Amino acid sequence: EIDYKDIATLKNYITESGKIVPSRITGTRAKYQRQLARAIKRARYLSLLPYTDRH
Amino acid sequence: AVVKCKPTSPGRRHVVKVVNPELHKGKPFAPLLEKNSKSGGRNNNGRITTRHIGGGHKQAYRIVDFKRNKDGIPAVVERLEYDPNRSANIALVLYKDGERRYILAPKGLKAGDQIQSGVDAAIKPGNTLPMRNIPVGSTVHNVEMKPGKGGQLARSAGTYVQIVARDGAYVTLRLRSGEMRKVEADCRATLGEVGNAEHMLRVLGKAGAARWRGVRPTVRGTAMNPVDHPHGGGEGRNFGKHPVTPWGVQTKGKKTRSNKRTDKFIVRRRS
């Protein structure tokens, strides 16, 4: 149920520089971590999330 | 298809020919033929002005529509035909009003495809539009350099041009030579690229195969006497001089373009 349009939820799993946080830090399952990575990449494409802190 | 002939003769050993089963096996469209008399490379003074031209098979000229100014009216491809006057193949198209014309056959075109010219034509190979209505980055051919003059760029087999930039009333084109040129946007171009791309893979195989195409032998300048060529004679094989044309102009490097009239359109020379 992870949606790339849920930026409020996706921002909890990215650092201050926009990088995805590892599953060891947030303690999320591997399956939902993969879903989160896919959703974050899609949201980066739609310019809803930044690729980096620069641009 | 590209096929290699079996070496049943020394003249056939290296022949590599291009066969196209979709070409029309029959006579061309008569109302679009003209007499095309040979010249032997002679001008109106009767002098040889271009060497190594002469003989070859008799050829009839096909009136190819390079302007494509019949806008709005759809047309269907009847058949692809061999054209001896150019490296590309030509397509006989039939407009809805009953007119038949010859166009350069783009890549992928086949009998039964529908093409159209004009500002409202769809973006697909074979359609002709003013270059300001063509998306930047697309690959086109049969490009005009003056509006309404007729296509002059990218007409050889397999050639094409890509529009790299558009600004104001001009577009920038990357020609097959690698040169960036500016052409005003009202000029027309046909989508896609010219067919018969494997034309460059053919191998003539024997000396006579070039004679059929009207090419006479080329004598090396170093094989002549000093009175005939700057590369002169010598006892044995001697060169000892910088390579030049038969008229003494340095070849192998010396640039000969001298045209200040069209320099404003050359964005960047080839390299």
Binding site: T15, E16, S17, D53 | -
Partner: protein, 56 residues
């Protein structure tokens, strides 16, 4: 690792915060990792050795 020196903070604490942020971002380790080419077999062997020594 953007650090905005907020009001009522000395320069030294801002510099130490900048260093802490740039080390938690891992930019120096990455730019030291990327300066030479590491063959795929080399990086696989290194990852395997690190995963093995992470067992104590």
């Amino acid at each position: 690792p953007v650090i905005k020196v907020r009001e009522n903070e000395p320069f030294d604490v801002a510099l130490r915060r900048f260093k802490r942020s740039c080390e938690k971002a891992g930019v120096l380790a990455e730019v030291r990792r990327r300066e030479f080419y590491e063959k795929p077999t080399t990086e696989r062997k290194r990852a395997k050795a690190s995963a093995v020594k992470r067992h104590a």
